[PDB]
Amino acid sequence: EFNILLATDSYKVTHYKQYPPNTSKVYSYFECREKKKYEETVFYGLQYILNKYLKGKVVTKEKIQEAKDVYKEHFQDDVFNEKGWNYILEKYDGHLPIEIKAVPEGFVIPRGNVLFTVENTDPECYWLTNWIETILVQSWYPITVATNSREQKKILAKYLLETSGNLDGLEYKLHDFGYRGVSSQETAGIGASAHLVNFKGTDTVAGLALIKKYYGTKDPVPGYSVPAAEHSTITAWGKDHEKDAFEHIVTQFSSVPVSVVSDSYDIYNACEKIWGEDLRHLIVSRSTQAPLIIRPDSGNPLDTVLKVLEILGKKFPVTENSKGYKLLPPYLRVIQGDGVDINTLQEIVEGMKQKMWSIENIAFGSGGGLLQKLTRDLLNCSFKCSYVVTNGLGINVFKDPVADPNKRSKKGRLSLHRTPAGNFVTLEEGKGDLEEYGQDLLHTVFKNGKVTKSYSFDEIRKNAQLNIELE
Amino acid sequence: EFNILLATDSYKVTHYKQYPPNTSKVYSYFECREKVKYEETVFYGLQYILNKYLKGKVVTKEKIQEAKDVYKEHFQDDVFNEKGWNYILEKYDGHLPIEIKAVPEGFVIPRGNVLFTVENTDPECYWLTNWIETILVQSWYPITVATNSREQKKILAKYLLETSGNLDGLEYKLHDFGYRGVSSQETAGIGASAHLVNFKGTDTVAGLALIKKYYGTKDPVPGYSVPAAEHSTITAWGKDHEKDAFEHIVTQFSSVPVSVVSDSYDIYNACEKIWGEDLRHLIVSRSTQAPLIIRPDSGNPLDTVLKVLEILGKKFPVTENSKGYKLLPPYLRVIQGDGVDINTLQEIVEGMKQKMWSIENIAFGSGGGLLQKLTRDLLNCSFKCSYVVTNGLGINVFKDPVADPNKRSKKGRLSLHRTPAGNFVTLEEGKGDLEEYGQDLLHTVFKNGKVTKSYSFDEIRKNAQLNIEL
Numbered sequence: 001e002f003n004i005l006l007a008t009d010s011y012k013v014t015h016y017k018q019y020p021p022n023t024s025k026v027y028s029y030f031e032c033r034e035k036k037k038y039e040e041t042v043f044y045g046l047q048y049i050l051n052k053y054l055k056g057k058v059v060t061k062e063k064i065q066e067a068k069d070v071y072k073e074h075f076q077d078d079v080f081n082e083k084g085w086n087y088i089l090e091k092y093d094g095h096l097p098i099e100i101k102a103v104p105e106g107f108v109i110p111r112g113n114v115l116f117t118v119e120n121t122d123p124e125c126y127w128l129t130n131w132i133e134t135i136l137v138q139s140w141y142p143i144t145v146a147t148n149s150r151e152q153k154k155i156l157a158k159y160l161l162e163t164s165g166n167l168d169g170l171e172y173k174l175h176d177f178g179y180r181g182v183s184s185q186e187t188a189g190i191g192a193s194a195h196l197v198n199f200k201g202t203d204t205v206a207g208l209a210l211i212k213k214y215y216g217t218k219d220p221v222p223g224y225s226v227p228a229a230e231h232s233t234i235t236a237w238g239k240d241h242e243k244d245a246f247e248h249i250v251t252q253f254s255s256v257p258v259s260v261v262s263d264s265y266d267i268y269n270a271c272e273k274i275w276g277e278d279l280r281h282l283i284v285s286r287s288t289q290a291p292l293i294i295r296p297d298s299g300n301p302l303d304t305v306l307k308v309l310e311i312l313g314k315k316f317p318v319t320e321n322s323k324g325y326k327l328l329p330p331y332l333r334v335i336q337g338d339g340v341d342i343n344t345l346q347e348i349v350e351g352m353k354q355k356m357w358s359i360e361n362i363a364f365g366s367g368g369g370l371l372q373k374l375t376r377d378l379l380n381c382s383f384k385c386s387y388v389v390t391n392g393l394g395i396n397v398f399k400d401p402v403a404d405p406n407k408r409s410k411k412g413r414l415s416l417h418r419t420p421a422g423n424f425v426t427l428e429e430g431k432g433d434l435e436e437y438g439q440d441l442l443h444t445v446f447k448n449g450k451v452t453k454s455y456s457f458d459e460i461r462k463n464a465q466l467n468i469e470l471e
Numbered sequence: 472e473f474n475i476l477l478a479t480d481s482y483k484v485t486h487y488k489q490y491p492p493n494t495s496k497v498y499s500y501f502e503c504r505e506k507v508k509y510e511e512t513v514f515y516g517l518q519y520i521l522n523k524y525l526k527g528k529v530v531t532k533e534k535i536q537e538a539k540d541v542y543k544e545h546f547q548d549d550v551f552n553e554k555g556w557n558y559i560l561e562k563y564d565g566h567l568p569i570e571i572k573a574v575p576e577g578f579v580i581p582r583g584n585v586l587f588t589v590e591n592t593d594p595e596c597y598w599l600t601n602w603i604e605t606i607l608v609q610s611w612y613p614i615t616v617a618t619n620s621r622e623q624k625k626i627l628a629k630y631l632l633e634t635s636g637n638l639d640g641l642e643y644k645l646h647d648f649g650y651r652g653v654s655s656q657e658t659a660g661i662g663a664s665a666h667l668v669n670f671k672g673t674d675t676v677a678g679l680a681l682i683k684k685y686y687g688t689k690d691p692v693p694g695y696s697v698p699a700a701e702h703s704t705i706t707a708w709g710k711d712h713e714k715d716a717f718e719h720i721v722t723q724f725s726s727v728p729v730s731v732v733s734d735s736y737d738i739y740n741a742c743e744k745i746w747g748e749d750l751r752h753l754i755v756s757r758s759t760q761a762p763l764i765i766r767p768d769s770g771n772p773l774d775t776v777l778k779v780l781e782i783l784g785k786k787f788p789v790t791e792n793s794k795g796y797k798l799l800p801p802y803l804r805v806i807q808g809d810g811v812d813i814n815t816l817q818e819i820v821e822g823m824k825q826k827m828w829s830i831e832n833i834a835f836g837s838g839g840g841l842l843q844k845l846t847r848d849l850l851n852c853s854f855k856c857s858y859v860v861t862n863g864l865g866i867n868v869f870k871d872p873v874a875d876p877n878k879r880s881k882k883g884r885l886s887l888h889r890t891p892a893g894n895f896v897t898l899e900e901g902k903g904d905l906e907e908y909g910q911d912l913l914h915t916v917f918k919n920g921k922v923t924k925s926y927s928f929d930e931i932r933k934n935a936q937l938n939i940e941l
């Protein structure tokens with residue numbers, strides 16, 4: 001079973017002895033710190049952590065004993081605060097005396113703004129605020145995936161609109177391939193759910209169950225996929241029987257969309273000789289609701305896509321859209337699912353526009369670039385203490401390193417407001433109490449062991465929408 | 472609860488209809504594909520996955536039903552293989568008819584060798600081999616962490632031996648700060664355990680429980696930490712009371728080692744004026760077994776370390792060791808726990824050597840660099856099919872992309888052997904049956920729902936050791 005007394009950085013076990021004496025409150029906030037691009041971030045993932053790890057009776061007699069035995073051997077000493085954890089057990093039946101206020105999930109906030117604040121509601125539990133830092137900071141991950149996935153959506157939207165005149169199929173242009181490329185099972189589900197905030201296509205099944213259990217949707221499932229081949233299902237037929245492999249597969253999925261990887265031996269031979277001549281008759285007869293989706297999987301991403309399109313364009317009836325861009329027949333599409341990140345995605349769609357190919361022809365699949373190749377310093381997600389109460393007097397606290405102004409932190413009690421121009425501003429030093437800036441957009445989502453406010457996955461999707469989508 | 476029927480890439484659900492008719496055997500392998508850095512890898516983590524996800528009754532009527540309802544909505548169609556999973560449920564009581572062979576955990580294998588293989592034991596379950604590719608491939612992560620952690624140990628070992636003459640304290644030179652920098656709780660456990668294969672210092676508690684549950688050690692715990700301050704335990708005293716904070720903290724932990732972060736306002740001021748003058752008397756009186764460890768946490772890593780060292784060198788009695796390198800008094804040490812990954816680690820220790828500072832003075836903390844900033848293409852961890860049997864005839868299969876020779880896969884039944892010079896070789900096309908390279912080095916570790924071979928964390932530590940240590 002999960003034990004919250006063991007879900008923290010080791011040194012935090014010794015922190016209760018290090019605060020100023022007569023301290024009755026510790027107030028801390030979380031922010032995607034601003035750096036001297038990712039100028040706005042999608043706040044998502046907190047609700048998952050609250051339900052799975054923080055709510056309810058998280059402290060038992062046995063968990064305190066287990067933690068005591070582990071920490072004694074871990075530190076070679078008895079630094080564990082048994083009294084403090086016992087207090088919570090007896091006074092609150094193991095419920096955390098903590099109040100967490102947070103901006104609504106799905107919200108899109110510029111960098112350098114408070115996203116959530118954490119404080120203790122019992123004077124005896126001043127130490128509890130930064131005890132659960134580690135478990136709350138890990139929300140940087142669904143925030144970063146959702147933010148980075150959305151930024152890619154922006155790029156796709158821009159070029160799809162310029163080359164086709166609309167945004168049809170936009171929410172299916174970036175597919176999640178990264179189930180195998182992530183570090184663990186829990187990570188898979190979390191990351192996949194963050195991607196689904198912006199898109200509808202995924203192969204990471206783990207994210208589906210997370211959303212149903214923790215967020216919920218009106219629709220049965222939030223993510224979809226289609227039948228497809230991998231290299232094993234093709235190579236199993238033997239080197240000399242790739243055509244037999246291909247033919248068999250498209251016949252098995254004649255009435256639904258089907259993707260087939262064609263780069264096992266020679267991507268350019270398959271597209272020109274096999275798809276383009278030998279099995280052309282099985283392709284041109286397909287429905288618009290069930291196209292063949294050719295999948296190159298190696299070589300330079302831009303160069304391979306262009307050459308595949310160049311080949312297919314000469315073997316199939318190509319039309320020109322109203323914007324003047326070349327479009328494949330509705331039964332034939334291409335997916336690039338190898339080596340795709342936010343950087344190469346820009347290079348490909350930009351290169352496609354150069355050669356007058358519409359973005360309608362292409363979908364994208366991203367593995368580790370979408371889910372794994374992300375760190376906490378990308379958005380500088382940080383958790384800092386800003387306000388404490390010692391001897392009944394509250395002081396505004398902050399760090400301000402001489403060698404790095406970028407690591408300076410906010411002072412005092414914080415609040416998030418709309419500016420008169422409709423932008424966001426974080427008020428410091430409790431200045432939000434002057435009520436010059438309207439209502440604080442931070443809401444109590446957790447208090448004294450209960451989840452006090454919840455959002456469905458539908459609300460979150462609406463919040464994280466693009467301006468180009470609203471228009 | 473975990474459901475193995477929902478623990479795979481979505482398109483794999485459709486693959487059973489895609490193999491050639493009359494396929495009775497699918498045989499697949501896992502390797503860190505070959506491409507001057509990371510020439511060898513540490514095999515670790517597969518045992519965790521076998522015990523948590525693959526062993527015992529993993530199929531139930533409820534799980535089959537649950538998967539059926541999910542996939543019908545997921546594909547907007549019925550493509551799920553209910554009969555196949557029902558066969559396993561009835562015929563084997565939910566145990567997976569799967570044979571997995573593998574190299575011992577902890578083993579250091581050069582790139583491009585078979586690390587493990589997977590094949591179905593029942594003709595009816597040919598599709599099962601690659602169904603579990605996704606859960607098995609995720610072992611890239613403990614492998615990559617273990618490997619990148621060990622490569623950092625090589626660097627530290629090299630420079631510690633050079634500037635001190637021995638390897639004392641090496642297993643405590645790279646500390647794990649990665650708990651908050653990782654993508655989840657589960658990853659934190661797996662990643663931290665992978666680090667503990669090479670070192671002993673960790674702050675990620677979750678790694679200890681994983682080792683105890685899945686590997687076990689002779690000692691009560693495989694990892695250790697010391698009391699330390701964070702930026703909140705210092706700043707809470709107010710900007711005008713940093714000295715008050717320092718004094719309170721080093722007095723609470725006056726007989727045990729303690730680390731104090733000193734860059735909240737001015738790192739160079741805290742070292743020169745606060746540690747070096749005002750509270751100097753509290754430092755010089757400390758036991759050697761309980762040193763103060765100063766921790767900067769900002770600025771250029773190398774520049775900050777050197778300047779901090781030069782300041783303390785003029786405030787405290789510095790000696791010179793038998794190698795000619797400068798050494799702080801035994802009650803005073805430094806830890807750099809910011810911006811540390813394998814590249815900057817190399818830059819710092821080399822920089823210290825040039826300025827005649829011993830590596831004995833310093834230890835390193837790493838967060839995302841150690842546990843998060845890693846992907847699957849770093850060691851090119853891959854899972855591919857190499858052998859199938861259709862119509863009672865074995866076929867050696869492979870991929871060979873015309874545009875990428877590096878993505879070429881191995882052919883046929885594989886085996887791992889010792890060369891006459893004592894190196895590793897992977898034999899293809901069943902050539903291991905010729906018995907010209909001796910015995911196969913892979914062991915059977917999973918058969919028909921049962922873990923058939925395991926390793927203690929101590930044995931894994933022994934196998935992973937550096938040559939210089941041996």
Ligand SMILES: O=C(NCc1ccc(S(=O)(=O)c2cc(F)cc(F)c2)cc1)c1ccn2ccnc2c1
Nearest residue numbers: 175177201203224225228257259293335363480482
């Ligand atoms: O091919 C894979 N999956 C199948 C697949 C096929 C097409 C599309 S699509 O985006 O074209 C698409 C989406 C969709 F929802 C409706 C639709 F009509 C068209 C997406 C996904 C796959 C999965 C994981 N991987 C890991 C490593 N490699 C892979 C490969």
Ligand SMILES: O=C(NCc1ccc(S(=O)(=O)c2cc(F)cc(F)c2)cc1)c1ccn2ccnc2c1
Nearest residue numbers: 009011646648672674695696697699728730806834
């Ligand atoms: O300071 C942190 N932890 C405390 C700490 C301090 C010093 C050493 S040590 O390597 O000096 C050491 C090790 C040991 F086992 C014996 C010993 F004597 C000396 C190790 C650990 C810490 C933890 C997580 N973080 C995340 C972000 N930042 C942090 C910081």
